Design a protein around this ligand. Structure first.
Ligand code: ZN
Ligand code: ZN
Ligand code: ZN
Ligand code: ZN
Lengths: 55, 56
DNA sequence: GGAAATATTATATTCC
DNA sequence: GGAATATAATATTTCC
């Protein structure tokens, strides 16, 4: 499960290529109101709670 | 800039950003939690952590 | 201009 | 075991 780029290795594959996105620049999670893109869903979840809501 | 870390020699824009960075070497965690005793290297990191403790 | 806060990003660690 | 939550470091933005 080792990073082909930085010689780091994790216990899971899911953790492995969340890490890869820090190398390849892939950012699959996108904010509906803003267009800014993130590497993980939790990040965008944090960044989303900064846009004022409307419900 | 003029402010360089004496451990990793990465330069920082302003001395106050350097003193926070040095805490990532010394392990000095000044800011402590009122409810749970967990110590944090910055006031901000303590804020995002404190704001989940249900109610005081 | 510089300190402080806020937003950001990567990852370890719980959760499910 | 993947997904969520917490976390730590720093880049960006706000305030002064
Ligand atoms: Zn890597
Ligand atoms: Zn947005
Ligand atoms: Zn350093
Ligand atoms: Zn606490």
């Amino acid at each position: 499960h080792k990073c082909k780029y930085c010689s780091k290795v994790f216990g899971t594959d899911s953790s492995l290529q969340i890490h890869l996105r820090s190398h390849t620049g892939e950012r699959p999670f996108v904010c509906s109101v803003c267009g800014h893109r993130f590497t993980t869903k939790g990040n965008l979840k944090v960044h989303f709670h900064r846009h004022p809501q409307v419900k």
